[PDB]
């Protein structure tokens, strides 16, 4: 197909989101967003399907006190689909991945957005329900 | 590439003199550079060949 269309950003830096993967982390604390060139005073922000740098605040000791990549799979901020329907999730969630985009865990606890599944084949394969 | 065609291409790409001051590409028989910014320098070196 083509390329992802822009969607409303609702997770600026310092946002804490649930961890939907099986790694053992409970939440993800976003410290930066990949691909952001930015502007003065503007906080980098991520959306569903974006890759971010995050740390684990609650979880196994092995996962804490370090920086790892993560991909956002759910967001509460509504965004507009090309068909005109605005949609949103119940919570904010993400999954830990390696820089190549491979999931560190093996399963996803809840649903994931279609954009993230289209962008990341491994996450889609590990997902239960898309949208 | 055939030796004849290789030599033909090298005539345009390899056999040159390079000005030390401004790196200008000059004909193999050049004695002074043609560029004004280097004051038509006479400090020339051959273009280095692949070895």
């Amino acid at each position: 197909a083509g390329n992802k269309f822009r969607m409303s950003l609702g997770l600026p830096v310092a946002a804490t989101i649930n961890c939907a993967d099986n790694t053992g982390a409970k939440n993800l604390y976003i410290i930066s967003v990949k691909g952001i060139k930015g502007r003065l005073n503007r906080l980098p922000s991520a959306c569903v399907g974006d890759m971010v740098m995050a740390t684990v605040k609650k979880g196994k000791p092995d996962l804490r006190k370090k920086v790892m990549p993560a991909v956002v799979v759910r967001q509460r901020k509504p965004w507009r689909r090309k068909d005109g329907v605005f949609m949103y999730f119940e919570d904010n969630a993400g999954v830990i991945v390696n820089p190549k985009g491979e999931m560190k865990g093996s399963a996803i606890t809840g649903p994931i957005g279609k954009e993230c599944a289209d962008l990341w084949p491994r996450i889609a394969s590990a997902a239960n329900a898309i949208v | 590439i055939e030796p004849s065609l290789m030599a033909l291409a090298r005539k345009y790409n390899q056999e040159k003199m390079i000005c030390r001051k401004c790196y200008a590409r000059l004909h193999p028989r050049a004695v002074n550079c043609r560029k004004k910014k280097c004051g038509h320098s006479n400090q020339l070196r051959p273009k280095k060949k692949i070895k």
Binding site: - | L5, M6, A9, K11, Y12, N13, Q14, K47
Partner: protein, 191 residues
């Protein structure tokens, strides 16, 4: 030091008709017409006719001219000689394709007045070059991967060859190793 008189003369073959007026030189021959505007030269152009024989001569001289001014006499004479050669024999330039892996595909458009290069270093871009006035480009049959440029004006033929050559410059690579291109290999006369 302002030499009093610098003069040079050239012989004109009987098969060429030449006219000079206000430093405007017209050259006529079997192959066609050529023109040149030498108004930028502060020289005196004179055509001398021998009544007994009938042969023509062109004399160009400079009065109280410096070395810089005097250097143009031979330039003008060589230009007139080139015009005569072009109008009697014509000019033929030969170009050869050089490539290591990707063969260069040449497509001559209608009238032998344009050329297309498509596979230069495996590039998907199409290179377009238009032949100058009076110059035609044909693909040689007896020589593999050879382009033949023919015309009456030496400057136009050479400039067309230069355009073809410069349209296929290698970029972002060591040109000493990547020698691909189209280069002038022979300069001659059609006749």
């Amino acid at each position: 030091m302002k030499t009093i008189l610098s003069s040079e003369t050239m012989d004109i073959p009987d098969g060429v008709n030449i006219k000079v007026k206000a430093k405007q030189i017209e050259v006529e021959g079997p192959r066609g017409k050529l023109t040149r505007n030498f108004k930028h030269l502060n020289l005196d152009f004179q055509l001398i006719k021998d009544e007994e024989t009938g042969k023509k001569k062109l004399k160009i001289d400079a009065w109280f001219g410096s070395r810089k001014t005097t250097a143009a006499i031979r330039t003008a004479l060589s230009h007139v000689e080139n015009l005569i050669t072009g109008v009697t024999k014509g000019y033929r330039y030969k170009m050869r394709f050089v490539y290591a892996h990707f063969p260069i595909n040449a497509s001559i458009s209608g009238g032998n007045k344009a050329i297309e290069i498509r596979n230069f270093l495996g590039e998907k871009r199409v290179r377009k070059v238009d032949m100058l006035e009076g110059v035609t480009v044909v693909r040689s049959e007896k020589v593999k991967d050879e382009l033949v440029l023919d015309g009456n004006d030496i400057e136009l033929v050479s400039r067309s060859a230069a355009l073809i050559n410069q349209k296929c410059h290698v970029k972002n690579k060591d040109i000493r190793k990547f020698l691909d291109g189209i280069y002038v290999s022979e300069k001659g006369r059609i006749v």
